[PDB]
Design a protein around this ligand. Sequence first.
Ligand SMILES: *[C@@H]1O[C@H](CO)[C@@H](O)[C@H](O)[C@H]1NC(C)=O
Ligand SMILES: *[C@@H]1O[C@H](CO)[C@@H](O)[C@H](O)[C@H]1NC(C)=O
Ligand SMILES: CCCCCCCCCCCC
Ligand code: NA
Lengths: 271, 99
Amino acid sequence: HVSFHVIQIFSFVNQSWARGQGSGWLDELQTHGWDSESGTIIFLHNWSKGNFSNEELSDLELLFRFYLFGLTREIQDHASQDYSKYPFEVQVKAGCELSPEGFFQVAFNGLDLLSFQNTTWVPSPGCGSLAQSVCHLLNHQYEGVTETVYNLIRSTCPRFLLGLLDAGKMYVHRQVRPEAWLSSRPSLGSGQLLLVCHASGFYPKPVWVTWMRNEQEQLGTKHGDILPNADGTWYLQVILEVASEEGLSCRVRHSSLGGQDIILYWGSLVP
Amino acid sequence: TGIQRTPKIQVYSRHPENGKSNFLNCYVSGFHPSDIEVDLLKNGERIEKVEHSDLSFSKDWSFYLLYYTEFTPTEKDEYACRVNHVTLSQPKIVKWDRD
Ligand SMILES: *[C@@H]1O[C@H](CO)[C@@H](O)[C@H](O)[C@H]1NC(C)=O
Ligand SMILES: *[C@@H]1O[C@H](CO)[C@@H](O)[C@H](O)[C@H]1NC(C)=O
Ligand SMILES: CCCCCCCCCCCC
Ligand code: NA
């Protein structure tokens, strides 16, 4: 369950224009950012350092800077031959989930290109010609890289992620109670209204917003995506269409609420 | 040889009152490529000084961003989110509903 990883976006527009951007993630929780231009790590939280020495993190920040620039440099060098393959986007996802497992997934135009398996760069089974070409150079031509990538995902990432979890102890395990309300909205139908039940500003993400027609829980409502808020909390809304005045309620179940669940009554009940 | 996805715009508020300060959230999901133009609107005028997420992508490599501005709603005010992308033939205005 405990997964730390970095993400990279390499946008290649034309012969000259090409940029790179990264982030440091602890599952859905962003822990780090990358100053694309300057080549400087952004520590989002107090605990983003984890346990790592600044002499360490600086050397890491440095290696990242060289790579973030070099990958673009080396990519635009190969792309200098076929100015037709422009534009395109490279995507990188690499880290570990703690025995501990490390990883390095690469995508091209938002489709898996290659992976890092043991010490072998392995093409995603599909586009052979581009992957097989890249993979070759990675496996037999850029000499330092493979051992470094191996080390980062298997030695550094687990050492770091362990530190980061003991670092963010209070923040990563915090419980934020939801702010829940009801709402009316004209539906497309004659004598039909929508019943929006909201549950906002809650953390951790696992939540259960349900609409009840008196006694039974009603499947057949419009459940939304559990969406993000700038603060870090989550938001959900479940819509229930009702005909011109139909005694119903909304039960909201969150990890935070102490064995209890919020109940929200819309209008009158008639037992 | 790649993918092109249209953005999925979703508009909501950080809290539920007129005159009482809130936050308007515009969440743009699963799009390909990253080149996107997300705008926030107050009665159709492009809202300036509006902070956003660092670009990230879902398991399936489709991108996403959360857009937000500290706002104060009133009865006569209309808030929406305008997104334009290469997959979109013309911008997509998505109205923030209330009531
Ligand atoms: C490259 O693309 C950028 C847009 O990102 C544009 O401003 C620039 O003029 C383009 N340059 C060339 C030489 O095509
Ligand atoms: C991983 O590759 C190395 C060679 O680089 C080899 O010695 C080792 O046995 C391989 N292990 C697995 C699990 O493939
Ligand atoms: C021009 C074709 C795209 C090349 C993508 C390179 C991705 C390899 C990532 C590993 C480098 C350390
Ligand atoms: Na090597």
